[PDB]
Structure formats: structure tokens, C-alpha cells
Amino acid sequence: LCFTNVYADSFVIRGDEVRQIAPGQTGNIADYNYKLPDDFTGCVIAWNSNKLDSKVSGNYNYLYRLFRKSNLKPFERDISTEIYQAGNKPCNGVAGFNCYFPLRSYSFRPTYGVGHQPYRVVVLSFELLHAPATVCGPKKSTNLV
Amino acid sequence: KNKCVNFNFNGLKGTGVLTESNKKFLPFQQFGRDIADTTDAVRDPQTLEILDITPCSFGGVSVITPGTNTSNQVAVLYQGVNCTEVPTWRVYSTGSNVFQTRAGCLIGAEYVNNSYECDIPIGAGICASYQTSQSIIAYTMSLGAENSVAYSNNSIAIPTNFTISVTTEI
Amino acid sequence: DPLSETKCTLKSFTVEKGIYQTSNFRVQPTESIVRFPNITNLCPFDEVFNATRFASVYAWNRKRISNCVADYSVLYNLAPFFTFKCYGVSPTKLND
Amino acid sequence: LPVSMTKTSVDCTMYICGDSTECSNLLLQYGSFCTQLKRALTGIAVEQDKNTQEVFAQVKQIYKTPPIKYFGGFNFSQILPDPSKPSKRSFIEDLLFNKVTKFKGLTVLPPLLTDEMIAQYTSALLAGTITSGWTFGAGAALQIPFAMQMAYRFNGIGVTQNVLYENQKLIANQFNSAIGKIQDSLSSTASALGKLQDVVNHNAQALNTLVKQLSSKFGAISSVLNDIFSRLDPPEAEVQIDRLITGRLQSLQTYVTQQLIRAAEIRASANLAATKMSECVLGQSKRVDFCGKGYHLMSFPQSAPHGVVFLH
Amino acid sequence: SKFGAISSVLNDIFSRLDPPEAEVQIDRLITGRLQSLQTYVTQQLIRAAEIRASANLAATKMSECVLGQSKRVDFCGKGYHLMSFPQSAPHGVVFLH
Amino acid sequence: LPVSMTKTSVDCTMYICGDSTECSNLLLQYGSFCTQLKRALTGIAVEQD
């Protein structure tokens, strides 16, 4: 099959939640970060990065968000640094009463188990027969009869 | 009460109106059903009242029109619906084009008191036709002409004149 | 127009002479009535989740929890957990 | 002989779907399934009005009864309608009407020709049979006296005029007592009208069995369309709703097929009824066991719900 | 009509889905294409039954009205019958009474 | 001229199922569909007599 274009989204998920990339899941990443609708067409690529991207003192470079007020729409990036407000107390950009900081950091060390292993999740998105399609593998061509 | 709305009652969903139930029910009863596997009675858990559920959006839309080479005027037939409570066309709700029949009400057509031979039937004795500044008229379909013949003890009629008629059956 | 509603059902642009069936009435709902029982108490889920010692496989602890309002926000909004497997009910629809 | 049936129409939206947005979006993938089933029930309802036109009205001309009634020393008032009532009904058809006995996307179509106008077709064609003779349907109506009708209605079966004119006082004991046994039999028992009662009962058992297919689960877990969408997964709810739409359209294909077989059985009975209005009522036949048993004299039609009652 | 399947083309299901997954979706299309043929067996045979009773009425009026003299009323036409003239027609017959 | 035909009757349980307990429990989910088939072959057999 030959398709038009592809959107490759490269991100790192800790090793417990890497099974959660499917249409119709529920989780931390599967609700408030990355959703797949039921009409999605593509492939999910994973690889073991624990020999490379880990660190002895912990990986503080990659960060993630556990909090959103509602369900996020899919194929959308949330860049908002705004503090989640649970009550009627205003947060004013800092933590306080009914104010929690939404952005957390990963647990990555090589000496731990399976769920602390970093995995590199690359999800291809295929758009098939919606357009003229220039992208497929090395198929040959013959003369017209 | 008395509005067509969406329902969420204890996880169950539906659409209808809420009327007062006069039937004697069990005090331990959560809900009850119908002739199918469908509902009628629910129980409000906060304050105890049992209300009937009658569903909405009933009745059909029928149109009465001539051909496109004659006129674009369309009479609209409402089907089986009581018309005292009343498609995207709201212009015929002003009134005075409405005539109440047994089958429904007909809007966009003027009722006449004469009796003719029509073309497009409606139902329940009332028919319709496009006649004469021309519009759609509605009336009761005629039985034909009236013949009153006086009969007595001794009279006879003998025909003196003949014709040859040719009829075609297919 | 009901002239244009004749052509949509019959799939023809030339309307002949006669009475034609078209459609049915659609009454759109406006509001929504949601009636749930009011309980001020919450479900005791943090006692059975966060406890220090649990039971065994051959004899387990079956905890019946009733007459309260369930808090799913440790299950749904957060996941510091391991296995999520749901079968009959979708896990987003548990609060409904 | 029964003539017409009960005209029905089935909505595709209300019977298949529970007015949910998921069931209406999956119905458009199925397309023209209930478009043809709406069209096939439309073509039944055109032909039910054509069965009343070929039977009840033979001619377009209306004849009426003179108010001074002496016809042959007979009592004709049981088949003639009552002018004192606001409804036009005879004495026999008062007994004939009384012995013959919702939403969810079913409906009941009303008929075109009303039962008041069937009796106006009945009293017009009884006005031509009693007074005008046999010539009202073959052309313009003559004026034939009633003593001159039955002399030539005896002439077709081989009887001359010697029998009628001598015995004419003795026929009034025979004819008026025989028609009085018809009025007493139809008032006592409803079993003679039970052929017309089955036409109500075949339509009543067809509608009541069609609404009992909703409680059957059709292989799905729940038969409620709102309970699939509020519980199961959205890949799972596309399977279980489409098992119910496949199951309810097979019950709808069963219903429209059985109405077309009963439309063909009521077409051949109405063509038998339109023949006996043209032969037995509008003329004299030499046939055996068509216009009644033995020799034919004359035939009197009467109005009936969903049919016609002949008096031979 | 897509019959509940994703694509209504049999070549599109064979070029995309798994061989377990293509045998579900093609069998949804064949069951939709059987029921479209079973309405064709149903509706045309009823119209074959309605054309059987009309041709038996048409073969009666050739035997009665055309080939003989009938005394019937409103069978051979309105009024007293004399003779009848058949004429040929596409998918039918035209009588001149 | 032919008059009558051969009167037949089809059972619901014996043709569909192989007299197994799993097939008879799943037959009741379809409901009244076998009620219509038994009334149809009876109404042929009344009219053949």
C-alpha cells in the first residue's frame, strides 16, 4: 500500500505505561497527554533505551504532566505551565492551599526494574487514499499494456 | 414537567415527558417497563414520586404538490397529529390556510364548499385538486351527477335512437 | 421548502403529480434532567488500597462497600499503578 | 367476499432506533434497506384504494328511490337506507357494522373512501336493481315496472309468464319470510361475518408480533440501544448495536413479505367481488354456483367493513 | 452501501487487513449482498404471480370476447357485446371492444 | 387442473439444533421468530383442506 504522508511523534514513556498506546485506552498519558481515536491508521515503534538514555543520579531532562482539568483532544500539544486549581484559592503561579504543581520528572535509573526502564515510543500516522500518494517501499514498475 | 428533554435516571437514558402516575405501585419498586422491553415508570430517589414517561417526536410529513412544469405551490399534510399544539418551514403557522380533517390538518390549501371530481387523494373522504391566481383547493369527492326518475305503476321507456361505442381495455 | 423535500426522498429532480411521503417530526430536546441520590459521605477506597498488609490468594478479604459516593480520581485522574484491565464497562464511563 | 385490508405504514427511524444519535449514524451506512420497505408498503396502500373503486362503484351515475313505495306487494325497507337517521344505513347494515370489531413507528393509515360513501354506492346501485332493471349498467337506465322485471328474469331460466302473474300473492309469503331469516341469523351469531373478522385478526396478529421482536436480544447482551452505548467500549458498541439493526431488519423483511402475500390474496378476492357486482347485481347469469345455488333471479349488495355482503 | 464494514470494495479489505481480520469484514459484505438478492427473489416472484392472474384474464378474453359472443356485463366492455378486436402491444395486449 | 399440495411442517428445535443444551439456550434469545414459522405452515395446511 502507498500513502500520502506520515507524522512521526517521538517521545519517551516509562516502562509500565508503554502498553497503553492503543485506540480507546485510559491512563495518565492515555487521557491527559496522547489519545488515539478509533479511526487511527498507523504503527507503534518501541525500543529499549535503558543502556543509553538512563542516568545513575536520575534523568531530570525529560519531564511530564499528570494534571489537566478535563480530557484532552487528540493530536494536540499542551504547552501551558498554568497551575491546576482544585479549590477557590488562587494559586498565583506558585504552590499553596489547593494548588499542586502539575509537572513531574521521570524516575529513570538503570539499576531498577522493568517499569523504570525508559522506552522510546515512535508512533507513525498513516493517511491512506485521501490524496495522491507518493510514499511506499521499493516496488518496481512495468510498461502499460 | 411537560417538556421533551433527555433523561439520565440511575444510569438509564431516555427521552420523553413527565406526567403524574395515578396507578398503585409497590413501595419497594425502583422502575417498571412496557409491552416491549421499554420503560414507563421511574422513581426519584431523593424525594419519592413516580412519574410516567411518554415519548416524543411522533407523526409523519406528507406533501401534496402538482408537477414542476405547472406550479411550485405545495400543500403540506400532517399525518395523525392533533394540530392545536402546532419540517423547516415555519411560514404556514400564521394560520387561515388550515382545515381540520380526520386524517390530520391540511395547511397551504383553501377549503371550498363545492363538490367536484379531483385528482390527488388525501384520505377520510377529503380529496384535493389544483384549480383556479391559481392554488390548491380541498373538498369532498363527488359521487357523480344526480338522476331523479319518477316511477309509477304503468310506465315504460323504449329507446328510439342508437349508437355504436368503441371502448379500449389494456 | 417542501418542494425541495420531495426531491430529496424520491432522488429525482422532476416531481410528478401526486401525494408523496417525505419524513417524520423531529423535536429536539433542550435541557437534561439528571436525578441521582444525594449522599454526603464518600466511598472508603483509600482504606483498602493504601493498607499495609493484605490477605492471601486462597483466602482473600472481600470488602463490601455500599451507601456512599464513589471517588474514582485515584483510579482515573492518576495512575501510579501497574495493571489496568477493564472488560464489561469502559473505564471512562465509571463515574456515569 | 372481502374487498380491502387495513393499510399500514412503518417508520424506519422509530422502530429500528430508540432515537439515539449512534443508531442514526450507523443507519446511513446501511442505506436503502428501509427505503424499499417504505416503498413496498406504499404500493400496497395505492392498491387498497383501487379495490374499493372497482367493486363498490360500477357506474358514475347515482340513482335514488322515490318516496312513495309500493313495489310488487313486497317489503323492501330492510335493504333501503333510513332517511330519519343522519347516517345513511339500512336495517341489515346496522347488524353488519356492529359484529366486526400504536406509536413506536407503527401507524394506522385511514382509508380514502369512507363507510358512509360505501352505503351511498350501495343505495344507488340498489336503486337501479329494484326500479331501473338490468339496463342501468349497460347504458342509460330504462323505466321498467317491477311486475315486468321478474317476468323477464324468469325468462332467462326457462320459465314463462304463467307462473308469476297467477301466484304473485303467494310470492310475498315466500320472499318476505326468507329475507326475515337473514336478519335474524346475522343478529344472533357473528360467525357468518367471521371471514371479515379474520382480515382484522390477520392484521392485528401481524402488528402485535412485530413489536414483540424488540424484547428479544438477537444474540446481543442487551436489547436496549442506550445500554450498549453507556456501558461497552466504542469498538465493542459498533458490534453489538449492529447485531440489533441486522436482527430488527430481518423482522421487518418478514413483515413486508407477509403483507404482499396477503395483498395478492385480497386482489383475487376483490376481482371475484368486482366480477359478481358486474354479473350478478348488474345483470342475469345462467351460471351454476356463482350467483348462488340453483337458478339466478337477482342479487342485492350490502355494505360491510373491509368487504361486501351479497344477498342472493 | 458499506454494510457495516469499513470499505465496500473487496479489493480494499484484501489489501489492508489481517487474514483473520479480512474474513470478518468480507463476510459482513456477503451477508449484505445475499439479502439484496433475497429481496430480488421475493419481489419479482410476487410480480410474476400478479402477471399470472392478469394473463389468465387475458387468455380468457381472447377465448370469450374475441373468439365468441358473450352475454356478460362489464367483461367484454360496457353495454351489450357484439365483437372484440385484439391488437398487439409490448409486454401486453390492447383490446378494441 | 391441480388442486392440493403436500402439507409439511418444520420443527424449530430439530432443524436448527442438534439436540444440544447449548443450542437450545441460545435459541431463546431470538424469541418469537419460531412462533411465526409454525403459524405460517399451519395456515397453509388449513387452506389445503
UniProtKB/Swiss-Prot annotation, chain E:
Effect of T60I: In strain: Gamma/P.1
Entry function: Subunit of the fusion protein that is processed upon entry into the host cell. Mediates fusion of the virion and cellular membranes by functioning as a class I viral fusion protein. Contains a viral fusion peptide that is unmasked after S2 cleavage. This cleavage can occur at the cell membrane by host TMPRSS2 or during endocytosis by host CSTL. In either case, this triggers an extensive and irreversible conformational change that leads to fusion of the viral envelope with the cellular cytoplasmic membrane, releasing viral genomic RNA into the host cell cytoplasm.
Outcome (variant: S15A): In strain: Alpha/B.1.1.7
Designated name of the protein: Spike protein S2'
Superkingdom of the source species: Viruses
Residue range from the parent sequence: 968 to 1064 of 1273
Lineage: Viruses, Riboviria, Orthornavirae, Pisuviricota, Pisoniviricetes
Disulfide bonds: C65-C76
